[PDB]
Amino acid sequence: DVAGLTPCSESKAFAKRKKNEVKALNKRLKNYEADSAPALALKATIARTEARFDKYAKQGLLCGTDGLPHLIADPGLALRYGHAGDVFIPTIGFIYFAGWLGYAGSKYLQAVAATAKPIEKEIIIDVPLAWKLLWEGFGWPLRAFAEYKNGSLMEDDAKITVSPR
Amino acid sequence: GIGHSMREILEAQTPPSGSLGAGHKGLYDTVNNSLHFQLGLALASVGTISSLVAQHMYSLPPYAFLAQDFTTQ
Amino acid sequence: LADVNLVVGGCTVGALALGRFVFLPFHRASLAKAGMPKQNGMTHLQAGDARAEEASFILKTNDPAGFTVVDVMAWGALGHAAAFYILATSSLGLDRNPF
Amino acid sequence: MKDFTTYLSTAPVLTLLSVTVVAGLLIEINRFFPDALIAAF
Amino acid sequence: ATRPLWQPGVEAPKHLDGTMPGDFGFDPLNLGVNKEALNWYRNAELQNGRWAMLGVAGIVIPAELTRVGVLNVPEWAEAGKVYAESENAIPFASLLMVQLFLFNFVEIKRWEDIKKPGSQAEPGSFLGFESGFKGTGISGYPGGAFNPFGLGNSSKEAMDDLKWREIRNGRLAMVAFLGFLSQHAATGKGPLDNLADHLADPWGANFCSNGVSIPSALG
Amino acid sequence: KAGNWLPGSETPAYLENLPASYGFDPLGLAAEPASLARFRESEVFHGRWAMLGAAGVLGVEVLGYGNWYDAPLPLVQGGQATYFGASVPFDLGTLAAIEFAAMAGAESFRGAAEPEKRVYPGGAFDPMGMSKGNSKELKTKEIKNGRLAMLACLGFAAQHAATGASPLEALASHLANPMAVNFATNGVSLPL
Amino acid sequence: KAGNWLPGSETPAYLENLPASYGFDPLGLAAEPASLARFRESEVFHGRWAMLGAAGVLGVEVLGYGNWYDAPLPLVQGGQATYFGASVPFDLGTLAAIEFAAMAGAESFRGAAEPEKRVYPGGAFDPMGMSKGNSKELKTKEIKNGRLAMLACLGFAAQHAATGASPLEALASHLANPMAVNFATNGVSLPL
Numbered sequence: 006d007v008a009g010l011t012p013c014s015e016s017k018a019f020a021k022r023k024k025n026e027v028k029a030l031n032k033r034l035k036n037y038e039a040d041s042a043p044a045l046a047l048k049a050t051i052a053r054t055e056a057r058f059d060k061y062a063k064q065g066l067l068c069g070t071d072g073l074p075h076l077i078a079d080p081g082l083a084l085r086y087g088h089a090g091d092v093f094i095p096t097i098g099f100i101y102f103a104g105w106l107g108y109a110g111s112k113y114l115q116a117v118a119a120t121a122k123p124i125e126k127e128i129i130i131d132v133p134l135a136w137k138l139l140w141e142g143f144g145w146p147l148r149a150f151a152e153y154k155n156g157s158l159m160e161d162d163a164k165i166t167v168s169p170r
Numbered sequence: 171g172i173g174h175s176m177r178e179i180l181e182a183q184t185p186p187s188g189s190l191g192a193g194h195k196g197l198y199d200t201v202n203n204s205l206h207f208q209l210g211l212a213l214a215s216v217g218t219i220s221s222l223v224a225q226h227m228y229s230l231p232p233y234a235f236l237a238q239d240f241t242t243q
Numbered sequence: 244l245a246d247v248n249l250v251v252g253g254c255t256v257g258a259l260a261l262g263r264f265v266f267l268p269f270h271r272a273s274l275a276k277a278g279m280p281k282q283n284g285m286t287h288l289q290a291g292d293a294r295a296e297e298a299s300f301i302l303k304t305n306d307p308a309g310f311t312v313v314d315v316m317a318w319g320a321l322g323h324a325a326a327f328y329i330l331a332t333s334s335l336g337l338d339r340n341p342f
Numbered sequence: 343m344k345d346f347t348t349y350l351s352t353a354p355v356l357t358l359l360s361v362t363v364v365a366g367l368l369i370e371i372n373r374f375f376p377d378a379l380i381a382a383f
Numbered sequence: 384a385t386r387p388l389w390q391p392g393v394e395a396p397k398h399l400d401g402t403m404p405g406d407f408g409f410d411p412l413n414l415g416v417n418k419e420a421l422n423w424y425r426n427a428e429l430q431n432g433r434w435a436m437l438g439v440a441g442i443v444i445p446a447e448l449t450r451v452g453v454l455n456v457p458e459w460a461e462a463g464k465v466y467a468e469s470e471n472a473i474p475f476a477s478l479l480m481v482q483l484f485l486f487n488f489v490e491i492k493r494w495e496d497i498k499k500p501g502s503q504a505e506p507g508s509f510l511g512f513e514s515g516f517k518g519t520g521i522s523g524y525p526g527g528a529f530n531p532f533g534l535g536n537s538s539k540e541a542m543d544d545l546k547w548r549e550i551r552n553g554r555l556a557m558v559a560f561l562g563f564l565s566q567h568a569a570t571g572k573g574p575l576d577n578l579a580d581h582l583a584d585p586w587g588a589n590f591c592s593n594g595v596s597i598p599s600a601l602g
Numbered sequence: 603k604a605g606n607w608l609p610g611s612e613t614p615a616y617l618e619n620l621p622a623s624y625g626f627d628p629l630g631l632a633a634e635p636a637s638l639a640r641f642r643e644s645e646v647f648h649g650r651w652a653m654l655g656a657a658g659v660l661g662v663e664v665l666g667y668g669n670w671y672d673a674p675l676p677l678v679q680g681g682q683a684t685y686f687g688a689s690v691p692f693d694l695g696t697l698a699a700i701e702f703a704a705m706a707g708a709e710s711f712r713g714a715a716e717p718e719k720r721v722y723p724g725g726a727f728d729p730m731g732m733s734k735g736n737s738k739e740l741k742t743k744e745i746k747n748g749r750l751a752m753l754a755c756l757g758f759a760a761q762h763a764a765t766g767a768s769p770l771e772a773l774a775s776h777l778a779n780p781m782a783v784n785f786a787t788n789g790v791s792l793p794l
Numbered sequence: 795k796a797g798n799w800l801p802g803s804e805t806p807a808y809l810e811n812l813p814a815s816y817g818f819d820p821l822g823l824a825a826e827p828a829s830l831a832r833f834r835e836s837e838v839f840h841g842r843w844a845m846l847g848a849a850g851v852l853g854v855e856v857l858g859y860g861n862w863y864d865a866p867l868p869l870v871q872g873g874q875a876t877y878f879g880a881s882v883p884f885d886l887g888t889l890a891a892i893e894f895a896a897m898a899g900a901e902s903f904r905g906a907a908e909p910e911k912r913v914y915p916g917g918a919f920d921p922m923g924m925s926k927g928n929s930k931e932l933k934t935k936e937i938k939n940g941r942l943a944m945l946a947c948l949g950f951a952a953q954h955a956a957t958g959a960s961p962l963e964a965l966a967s968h969l970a971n972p973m974a975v976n977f978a979t980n981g982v983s984l985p986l
């Protein structure tokens with residue numbers, strides 16, 4: 006109970022929603038024979054729905070007035086109440102992966118900028134170099150922090166074009 | 171013989187170490203000479219106040235038997 | 244709620260006294276540094292605003308420290324504001340305390 | 343096959359293959375790990 | 384340059400010359416291209432290796448002694464809770480804060496040594512003890528008050544041999560502690576218990592049978 | 603100078619000849635001379651006021667007249683304040699008025715003087731003249747004791763805001779069991 | 795010099811003319827002359843206070859007045875301290891305050907003198923005037939007795955941390971049964 010929300014393990018409307026979904030899928034079932042391919046497909050869909058609802062009740066999600074999971078996007082409020090996987094852990098995951106992709110692209114730009122024809126290397130991508138830099142970009146946070154402390158990550162303003170005010 | 175010269179208040183609002191450059195050097199004449207600067211400031215403040223009026227009269231109804239007239243609010 | 248006469252008179256006399264003897268040098272220094280409100284260089288009067296001319300009933304005073312009538316009225320107004328503030332906040336008998 | 347591999351290294355071929363492999367990886371992730379609302383470890 | 388490498392066939396990167404202890408030319412991510420960043424990573428490797436050696440010793444020696452009926456030490460993963468239930472136990476937050484305060488005092492000095500190697504040795508710092516912080520010119524190898532027995536300070540190449548032994552032992556213990564963490568996360572048993580179970584049936588008892596490494600969704 | 607605060611670091615050059623200089627300005631707040639001056643008078647004045655405040659906080663506890671927190675409470679929701687357990691006939695409004703008048707006079711006369719006399723005025727403020735004979739070291743003592751007293755007053759305020767006890771009773775409680783009553787045990791300082 | 799700590803070793807150059815020197819500095823703590831100059835006075839001071847403490851604990855145990863550990867135990871529990879049966883109506887706060895004042899005065903008026911004068915003074919501290927007439931071997935005796943006294947005091951502390959009994963009681967128990975009553979037998983010194 007972090008903001009007037011109840012856990013979906015004990016909230017009644019979550020179970021009501023699960024029952025309604027399973028009942029609708031059973032209403033879909035009650036038209037085919039037991040061993041037909043549509044019957045197997047609907048049975049798989051039912052199993053997936055029950056597994057999803059049981060997993061959501063297991064993971065400790067919060068449900069509001071009705072049975073819909075709510076996520077917490079405050080560190081501390083999610084850390085001490087055990088919901089860091091709602092926003093905080095995916096925040097760290099996205100920051101890592103986006104930094105990996107962006108650092109790989111950046112290093113490709115600075116690697117092909119000092120070649121004979123940097124114009125050609127951006128439509129005709131050197132695949133081994135791109136693969137190597139994509140691998141090297143997995144250590145993007147340490148490399149980026151090192152280049153920031155070295156001062157080689159940013160460019161001086163006196164070497165950057167601006168408009169004449 | 172008492173009161174403020176706002177030009178000197180703008181002159182004195184210059185933090186050291188060049189944090190704001192020259193600070194507010196000559197902003198008094200910049201505002202006073204420019205009717206467009208004054209009109210921009212006035213429109214910005216008046217629009218923000220209009221937003222405040224909208225956000226306040228629905229939540230703190232001022233007039234008698236308001237917030238029952240749903241179309242009016 | 245402890246006599247409006249004594250409170251108002253004492254606060255006004257105190258505001259006048261700390262304005263004449265205590266706060267006068269810093270106020271004079273601030274009035275000298277700020278000086279005239281000036282527009283595009285010169286003051287309002289030098290630019291043509293005849294209504295912005297320094298009134299002559301404050302320029303010369305027989306006060307040895309140059310405490311004019313306008314200073315007297317400003318300090319008396321501040322003292323009256325303080326006196327009526329304390330009188331009004333002593334008139335109310337409610338728990339304004341955060342305890 | 344140098345010219346053919348250069349054509350395969352051209353920007354549209356590489357971006358289509360890259361979005362194809364990324365989309366396929368995400369699709370198989372959702373196939374084996376469906377309905378992952380949160381990063382519950 | 385002809386030293387053994389992490390891949391007989393792959394030449395070493397140009398930022399790994401051979402001077403650093405344990406330089407086998409292993410840097411496929413090129414994290415240490417910056418020299419100052421390389422020095423910081425060398426100090427971090429030394430600190431992580433030394434702390435992992437201490438931790439792995441304090442895990443595997445008490446666990447072995449418990450296995451042979453000496454001292455009877457509980458599992459390393461639950462040793463925090465075993466002490467925390469004592470009748471005279473220091474509270475967790477207070478104990479953590481005391482440890483962090485002492486480590487703050489010590490390792491800010493170590494940090495300032497990392498920047499300038501002759502930092503803390505200046506006169507008037509301590510109360511006569513500043514003479515023991517001269518350093519050996521390389522950060523992470525202080526000497527002085529540290530190294531009382533003076534091992535390796537005789538022939539220079541004797542110290543380089545000990546440096547390589549230290550870095551290999553530190554890397555081995557870091558891998559070992561990662562193994563301890565991953566083994567207890569998957570299997571609720573000790574490292575020696577996992578080792579004993581593996582020797583019972585190596586084809587059956589491993590990382591493909593814990594059910595946590597390889598996900599059950601794929602299989 | 604005598605000091606380095608970070609012994610393995612280089613201190614700012616403008617903090618060398620000042621008394622009680624350890625070169626502690628990592629934020630560079632006094633890189634300008636006028637700001638450094640103003641900070642110097644502010645530091646000495648804050649130190650003196652904090653020494654008076656900390657002395658009062660310790661003295662009211664050691665003499666047995668409550669803490670520094672319940673002292674203004676008798677003047678509120680009733681009246682009749684006490685000093686040394688005695689009686690005063692002044693309520694809150696006129697006490698504030700008299701204090702405002704006295705402080706206005708004293709600080710208007712102090713602030714209108716020479717900058718060196720705004721912090722170090724000889725004569726009537728040194729009746730027996732013990733500033734003679736190199737006052738540099740004694741000034742270093744003054745600013746250091748002032749820094750300790752500012753730390754003490756901030757500690758009094760923060761400890762009462764966290765635990766709600768008196769400083770001397772908090773000291774006794776800390777000496778009772780330093781393992782398990784420190785700042786990491788209350789629910790305020792560490793959000794656990 | 796007399797001694798070399800190890801029978802065969804290379805000797806530090808800065809430990810030769812010092813009294814009671816055996817060349818024992820494998821850490822090299824006194825490589826700097828200032829470090830040695832401070833640490834010599836520190837060693838003399840530690841030895842003197844250790845002799846005083848060892849004399850105090852032996853005289854409080856063999857005279858049959860109590861244990862050194864239990865000396866501040868009756869200082870709380872109500873009050874009333876014990877010294878030769880005296881009532882001494884001093885509580886915990888005033889005792890600590892008087893001791894702190896006396897120590898602050900004595901140490902402030904002490905260590906403001908010359909380096910030789912801070913550690914080796916004359917005047918009223920040698921009234922019989924027998925520092926004159928060969929002081930080197932007497933200084934050696936002072937340092938050696940001080941080292942023995944520091945060892946004795948740290949032994950008392952470690953022994954009461956171990957078994958938890960009196961010094962002379964532990965000595966008597968060790969003399970009575972030297973087999974099962976040693977440092978090795980209790981479960982705190984030898985774990986194997």
Ligand code: CLA
Pocket residue numbers: 106107108109110111113130134135136138139
């Ligand atoms: C890897 C290349 C790369 C990198 C490092 C950056 C970095 C940045 N961009 Mg940019 N951008 C890029 C490509 C890139 N961009 C491309 C291709 C476009 C055209 C669609 C844009 C259009 C764009 C706009 C309009 C803006 C930025 C802005 C910014 C800055 C804000 C952070 C951000 O992520 O914004 C968002 C970035 C995007 C929305 C574009 C991402 C597109 C893909 C994911 C990147 C390309 C991947 C590359 C092909 C990988 C090559 C791998 C290599 C091994 C070959 C940031 C420094 C903002 C800014 O100025 O901040 C102040 C801003 O306004 N970008």
Ligand code: CLA
Pocket residue numbers: 640643644645647648651702705706707709710712713714
């Ligand atoms: C009406 C009486 C009066 C007058 C005329 C003055 C006049 C003056 N005081 Mg002063 N003071 C007074 C009463 C008065 N004081 C009282 C009752 C106290 C409590 C005992 C103090 C305590 C005090 C201190 C400690 C200092 C002064 C200083 C000064 C001088 C600097 C000008 C100034 O204040 O900056 C401009 C005025 C303002 C900015 C008004 C704001 C006032 C607030 C309370 C200050 C904000 C700081 C805040 C408390 C802490 C910052 C946030 C922090 C938590 C991070 C000035 C001549 C300073 C000095 O000696 O010269 C540098 C100085 O350090 N005064």
Ligand SMILES: CC1=C[C@H](O)CC(C)(C)[C@H]1/C=C/C(C)=C/C=C/C(C)=C/C=C/C=C(C)/C=C/C=C(C)/C=C/C1=C(C)C[C@H](O)CC1(C)C
Pocket residue numbers: 409410411412413414430431432434435436437438439441442458459460462463557558560561
């Ligand atoms: C080289 C490279 C480069 C390229 O380029 C790239 C790449 C590939 C990335 C790379 C690699 C890397 C790696 C491998 C890493 C790893 C690390 C680690 C593992 C660490 C640990 C580390 C570790 C550590 C410190 C640890 C420590 C530990 C400890 C203290 C412990 C403690 C303890 C004990 C005693 C027992 C108890 O009861 C409990 C506790 C309390 C728990």
Ligand SMILES: CC1=C[C@H](O)CC(C)(C)[C@H]1/C=C/C(C)=C/C=C/C(C)=C/C=C/C=C(C)/C=C/C=C(C)/C=C/C1=C(C)C[C@H](O)CC1(C)C
Pocket residue numbers: 626627628629630631648649651652653654655656658659669670671673674751752753755756
């Ligand atoms: C230097 C630097 C530089 C770099 O760069 C940066 C940084 C780091 C930021 C820095 C640092 C800073 C700081 C630490 C600060 C602080 C201060 C303080 C604490 C003050 C206080 C201060 C404090 C003070 C004055 C206080 C005072 C007090 C008082 C008066 C008291 C009074 C009282 C008493 C008696 C008692 C009663 O019953 C009540 C009363 C009435 C209340």
Ligand SMILES: CC1=C[C@H](O)CC(C)(C)[C@H]1/C=C/C(C)=C/C=C/C(C)=C/C=C/C=C(C)/C=C/C=C(C)/C=C/C1=C(C)C[C@H](O)CC1(C)C
Pocket residue numbers: 818819820821822823840843844846847848849850851854861862863865943944945947948
């Ligand atoms: C030289 C060197 C150099 C190289 O290089 C390295 C190395 C090896 C480190 C080194 C060595 C060192 C060492 C051995 C040290 C030790 C010291 C000590 C033992 C101290 C004690 C010290 C000790 C001490 C002071 C003690 C003192 C004692 C006392 C006061 C006592 C008191 C008391 C008494 C009377 C009785 C009562 O009932 C109680 C009381 C009141 C409590």
Ligand SMILES: NCC(=O)NCC(=O)O
Pocket residue numbers: 832835905906
């Ligand atoms: N100038 C006094 C001094 O150097 N004292 C050092 C010590 O405490 O021994």
